[PDB]
Design a protein around this ligand. Structure first.
Ligand SMILES: Nc1nc2c(ncn2[C@@H]2O[C@H](COP(=O)(O)OP(=O)(O)OP(=O)(O)O)[C@@H](O)[C@H]2O)c(=O)[nH]1
Ligand SMILES: Nc1nc2c(ncn2[C@@H]2O[C@H](COP(=O)(O)OP(=O)(O)O)[C@@H](O)[C@H]2O)c(=O)[nH]1
Ligand SMILES: COc1ccc(/N=N/c2cc(OC)c(OC)c(OC)c2)cc1O
Ligand SMILES: [Ca+2]
Ligand SMILES: [Mg+2]
Lengths: 155, 437, 426
């Protein structure tokens, strides 16, 4: 079963093995027990070259795991700026909502990724999107006392 | 002649003790090395000063005193001071680690490491006495050693010296010069466990002494040196009857008979007058009537309280200096109708009078001017319950949330001891109310 | 009592630890060689608290240096005051922690903990009457956080009656862009709540904000952030190192500042704020109670002070300090809990630090510190909900329940601060 080998290769950053497995019929949209695909793992562990190769071979840019997370959610949470830009260029839903009501904007705001917050806003991230507790990205910036984030969100 | 042993516990007791023994030496004419040229009997004697001083054989006059502290800093100043040759070196006892402002450390854990040595050293002084009458114990309410160690010591002295009297000179806390936030706790805990073992206790309110230094002595920011010099003057006036010839408060038993009508309400108020700055060296000398009137003014009291709010059970006036008995009696007559003095119905309305015709001594370097006549009034009034209420209120504010209680529990103490100590203070406030306040 | 044994663990621990010794040695008149060059006998009266007397009348710090990477050992030795440390007290490992708390607490760190405990015992037996321990470390890394907390628990086991004090650096995405730092800090806080008596919370978020907004530094460096850390550590340890009025010790500080056992995390502060090259008494009192002078990124006006200790340093009027402290207490009366009377203590020291003629150091136990813990808790939950990089910890033997237990304990600590923030005395 090459689907499990492609998931391991995408996580470990084995660029050459990703090429070999796809050439031998491996399922690019293979999922692990929690619904994560090779694109989710590549976006989480910061393998930009694997993200681009998977997107040129039919990866669903808006795939969701059992908790509603898209690859854009995970790249915005971990802080991989170049991956966030490649994903948005390939049609990622900037306003995708996971099982906690969080959007990628919420996660980049919580983790202090200010450059990713700016990129998301320039691609139409909804400043009024509330999480399950009713909080928008701006509410997070006021509650935590993050003046730099509050200034970026007031643009 | 019946001997008295003084015990000084913790920083406050040691520092006040050092100031008191310096003043006692100047009043009896004892040099810092222990020599007394006026003492004709070398090697011993039955004179009044021998109640506080023993004699060795080479004419040395040694205080009947023991200094104890759980850390050495403060006692080391007495070991290197001016009167370093005066005390017995084995009667200056120090541990290595203090009670960290915690009653439980002073009473249960740290204090237990040195209690047997302290009692064995006290025993050596006791064995040297022909007629020991009791002990004078100096200590703070707020410190961990002053509160916890003193309570442990007082419990042991009651077992080993059953029929002997025990008097206290206690420092009540003031926020202006306090050292710890838990001092109300330490004050209530030591009062509860010492109440049964003490016959009479003279509380000294640091706020009252601080205010006197500011108002009368013009000292902007009084330090412990200024406070202790004034406290030693008052302590000397109280103990003068035990160290000199006289007919009032001549032994420790008489302090109880004259000032303590019931065992638990054993906290008399001391008032002292006149307190004049040393820069006013050419001040007009105040008459007997003027200084006696000053004893009924709350500003001259050792404890902040209002005696107009209470009733008197006892009142002793102890004069020092140029005081004619008929002038005292005339002043007592005027301070019966002109002022509002109410005694309890079950006690005689009389005032006990004692006169020592030598004026008070001033210490070189002190803040007080020399005076031709001075007076110390000792009275048991129900108004002193105001001091207990202020302390109980501070205890209640913190204890309702159990703030800082874990520090006491972590040092071998049960939480129940806090409620039983507070219950005893509730009963004590009620005891004053039952008499009348 | 007197002696303190100091321990500095991990990258951050050793960097801020070395700066502490450089700053206090200059104040006490000790050169890198160890010889005394000061012109005042007040610099030597309480030297025994931090230094041991060596042969030839020379003073060697009672400091233990530890890390799982040898590179840190070389960086400390090559410093100005690097040769004064005892070479026997340098306990370094071969493989580092790699910003992983589990490597420091259970695998790499657990194998080197016995060797550090041997030099701790050696320093402790040479003490006349040891009062406690002070540890410098970060909570976002692997060695200072993971091995530092393991070393605290083992020292607590052999010395259960001695005080444990820490200078803990809290992480911020503004200084270090490593997303596993909320995991390492949350796991460390779970340990600190149980095993330390008093912790100074030095927050990198607050240090960066001070440098960038107040000192106008566009790109603050670690040296700039550590300039404020060294000034804070000098200020909070002043009374332990000089005579003054207070008979200074860590146990009396704990008994008076910690009303509840778990609420032992202090918010330090300093005034004036200055840079690595570039005041009246009422001006110092005002800055001490301002949110911009706090070393923890929390607004004191958002909570209530349970206890406060202030240390004024320099030549100044004693009555003026008493008067100005009283004025700030009345104007800000609603920010102090009314159920702990006389909860603000003032200390004075004549010897000021070098460069400044007068300074003030603030130590507050305030409920507003919950904002610092909520910031770390939110980042921990954002990462933990997606189980990101969890295998890096479970792979070293850690159980998944340890993350949930640390998370639950931190939320209970925030709940405990809110309980006493809303309490009333009547
Ligand atoms: N009048 C006066 N009060 C003092 C003096 N020294 C301390 N105090 C008061 O005593 C209380 C503190 O207790 P201390 O006597 O210093 O403490 P201790 O008995 O040594 O106990 P620990 O240090 O906790 O072991 C505070 O209320 C101080 O204001 C002094 O010399 N004179
Ligand atoms: N203020 C300050 N923070 C530091 C310093 N060195 C590292 N840090 C912080 O410490 C964290 C990383 O921990 P570090 O001490 O490098 O790791 P360790 O060697 O595993 O203990 C991050 O939050 C850094 O920002 C320093 O010298 N000063
Ligand atoms: C809530 O009221 C209080 C608050 C703090 C108090 N003491 N504070 C200190 C501070 C110290 O240095 C930081 C000490 O040196 C390490 C220190 O050793 C004695 C005490 C005292 C209080 O009564
Ligand atoms: Ca004789
Ligand atoms: Mg003491």
């Amino acid at each position: 079963d090459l689907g499990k080998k492609l998931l391991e290769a995408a996580r470990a950053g084995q660029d050459d093995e990703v090429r070999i497995l796809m050439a031998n019929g491996a399922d690019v949209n293979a999922t692990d027990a929690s619904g994560l695909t090779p694109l989710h793992l590549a976006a989480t562990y910061g393998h930009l070259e694997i993200v681009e190769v998977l997107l040129k071979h039919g990866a669903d840019v808006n795939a969701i795991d059992i908790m509603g997370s898209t690859p854009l959610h995970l790249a915005a949470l971990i802080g991989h700026l170049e991956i966030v830009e490649v994903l948005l260029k390939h049609g990622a839903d900037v306003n995708a909502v996971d099982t906690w009501g969080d959007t990628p904007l919420h996660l980049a705001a919580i983790m202090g990724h200010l450059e990713i917050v700016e990129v998301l806003l320039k691609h139409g991230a909804d400043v009024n999107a509330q999480d399950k507790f009713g909080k928008t990205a701006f509410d997070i910036s006021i509650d935590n006392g993050n003046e730099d984030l509050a200034e970026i969100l007031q643009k | 002649m019946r001997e008295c042993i003084s015990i000084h516990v913790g920083q406050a007791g040691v520092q006040i003790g050092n100031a008191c023994w310096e003043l006692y030496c100047l009043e009896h004419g004892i040099q810092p090395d222990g020599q007394m040229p006026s003492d004709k009997t070398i090697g011993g004697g039955d004179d009044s000063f021998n109640t506080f001083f023993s004699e060795t054989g080479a004419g040395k006059h040694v205080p009947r005193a023991v200094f104890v502290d759980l850390e050495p800093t403060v006692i080391d100043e007495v070991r290197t001071g001016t009167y370093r040759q005066l005390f017995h070196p084995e009667q200056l006892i120090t541990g290595k680690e203090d009670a960290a402002n915690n009653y439980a450390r002073g009473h249960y854990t740290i204090g237990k490491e040195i209690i047997d040595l302290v009692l064995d050293r006290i025993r050596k002084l006791a064995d040297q006495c022909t007629g020991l009458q009791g002990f004078l114990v100096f200590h703070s309410f707020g410190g961990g050693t002053g509160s916890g160690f003193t309570s442990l010591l007082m419990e042991r002295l009651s077992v080993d010296y059953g029929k002997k009297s025990k008097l206290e000179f206690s420092i009540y806390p003031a926020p202006q010069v306090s050292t710890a936030v838990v001092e109300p706790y330490n004050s209530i805990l030591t009062t509860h466990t010492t109440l049964e073992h003490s016959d009479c206790a003279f509380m000294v309110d640091n706020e009252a002494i601080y205010d006197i230094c500011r108002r009368n002595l013009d000292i902007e920011r009084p330090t412990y040196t200024n406070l202790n010099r004034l406290i030693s003057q008052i302590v000397s006036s109280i103990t003068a009857s035990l160290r000199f010839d006289g007919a009032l408060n001549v032994d420790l038993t008489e302090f109880q008979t004259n000032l303590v009508p019931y065992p638990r309400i054993h906290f008399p108020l001391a008032t002292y007058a006149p307190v004049i700055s040393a820069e006013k060296a050419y001040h007009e000398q105040l008459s007997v009537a003027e200084i006696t009137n000053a004893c009924f003014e709350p500003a001259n009291q050792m404890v902040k309280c209002d005696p107009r709010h209470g009733k008197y059970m006892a009142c002793c006036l102890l004069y020092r200096g140029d005081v004619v008995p008929k002038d005292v009696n005339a002043a007592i007559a005027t301070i019966k109708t002109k002022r509002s003095i109410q005694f309890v119905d079950w006690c005689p309305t009389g005032f006990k009078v004692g006169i020592n015709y030598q004026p008070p001594t001033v210490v070189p370097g002190g803040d007080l001017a020399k005076v031709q006549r001075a007076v110390c009034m000792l009275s048991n009034t129900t108004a002193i319950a105001e001091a207990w209420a202020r302390l109980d209120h501070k205890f209640d504010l913190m204890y309702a949330k159990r703030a800082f209680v874990h520090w006491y529990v972590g040092e071998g103490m049960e939480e129940g001891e806090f409620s039983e100590a507070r219950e005893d203070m509730a009963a004590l406030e009620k005891d004053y109310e039952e008499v009348g306040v | 009592m007197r002696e303190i044994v100091h321990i500095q663990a991990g990258q951050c621990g050793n960097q801020i630890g070395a700066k502490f010794w450089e700053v206090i040695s200059d104040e006490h008149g000790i050169d890198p060689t160890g010889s005394y060059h000061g012109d005042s006998d007040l610099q030597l009266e309480r030297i025994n608290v931090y230094y041991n007397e060596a042969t030839g009348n020379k003073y060697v710090p009672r400091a233990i240096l530890v890390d799982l990477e040898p590179g840190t050992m070389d960086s400390v030795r090559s410093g100005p005051f690097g040769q004064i440390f005892r070479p026997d007290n340098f306990v370094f490992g071969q493989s580092g922690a790699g910003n992983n708390w589990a490597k420091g607490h259970y695998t790499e760190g657990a194998e080197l903990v016995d060797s550090v405990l041997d030099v701790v015992r050696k320093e402790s037996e040479s003490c006349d009457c040891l009062q406690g321990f002070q540890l410098t470390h970060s909570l976002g890394g692997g060695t200072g956080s993971g091995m530092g907390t393991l070393l605290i628990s083992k020292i607590r086991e052999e010395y259960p009656d001695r005080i444990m004090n820490t200078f803990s650096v809290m992480p911020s995405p503004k200084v270090s862009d490593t997303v596993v730092e909320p995991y390492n800090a949350t796991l460390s806080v779970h340990q600190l709540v149980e095993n330390t008596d008093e912790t100074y919370c030095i927050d990198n978020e607050a240090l960066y904000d001070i440098c960038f907004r107040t000192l106008k530094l566009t790109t603050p460096t670690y040296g700039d952030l550590n300039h404020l850390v060294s000034a804070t550590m000098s200020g909070v340890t002043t009374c332990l190192r000089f005579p003054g009025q207070l008979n200074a010790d860590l146990r009396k500080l704990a008994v008076n500042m910690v009303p509840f056992p778990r609420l032992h995390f202090f918010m330090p502060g300093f005034a004036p704020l200055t840079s690595r090259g570039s005041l009246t008494v009422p001006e110092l009192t005002q800055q001490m109670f301002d949110s911009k002078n706090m070393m923890a990124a929390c607004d004191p006006r958002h909570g209530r002070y349970l206890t406060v200790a202030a240390i004024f340093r320099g030549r100044m009027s004693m009555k003026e300090v008493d008067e100005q402290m009283l004025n700030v207490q009345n104007k800000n009366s609603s920010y102090f809990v009314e159920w702990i009377p006389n909860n603000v203590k003032t200390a004075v020291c004549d010897i000021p630090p070098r460069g400044l003629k007068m300074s003030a150091t603030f130590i507050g136990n305030s409920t507003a510190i919950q904002e610092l813990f909520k910031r770390i808790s939110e980042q921990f939950t954002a990462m933990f909900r997606r189980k990101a990089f969890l295998h890096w910890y479970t792979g070293e033997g850690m159980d998944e329940m340890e993350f949930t237990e640390a998370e639950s304990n931190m939320n209970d600590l925030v709940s405990e601060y809110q309980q006493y923030q809303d309490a009333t005395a009547d």
